[PDB]
């Protein structure tokens with residue numbers, strides 16, 4: 001027990017200003033700089049087809065759940081050195097919570 005639920009509305013706007021530049025979240029949403037993340041929970045890293053991911057991400061083979069997604073979110077290059085994900089992070093657990101509450105919801 002280490003992840004508690006945030007606000008999806010607050011999650012959704014965090015997403016629009018911090019992740020939209022690179023990702024789509026809708027079913028059948030296209031890949032961009034970053035891959036489409038629909039269905040990410042339960043899935044492992046580097047398995048969306050039609051996307052060229054770094055060695056590092058495939059290699060890490062992380063099961064995508066809220067718990068994991070939080071630490072990746074804090075510092076991705078940290079969590080997975082070699083990732084091409086150019087994002088500093090979300091150091092605030094509160095923001096992280098909203099946002100994950102949002103992804104838990106839309107990538108559904």
Ligand code: HEC
Nearest residue numbers: 018019022033034044045046053054057083084085086087
């Ligand atoms: C572009 C400047 C990005 C921003 C901003 C965010 N992400 Fe991203 N993401 C990007 C890339 C290029 C990649 C590929 C990684 C590689 O090393 O090949 C990723 C990857 C992810 C993943 C992992 C998914 C998988 O298929 O295993 C996740 C869960 C992810 N990105 C989520 C995410 C969120 C929620 C963001 C906003 C806070 C975000 N990323 C920022 C590109 C970019």
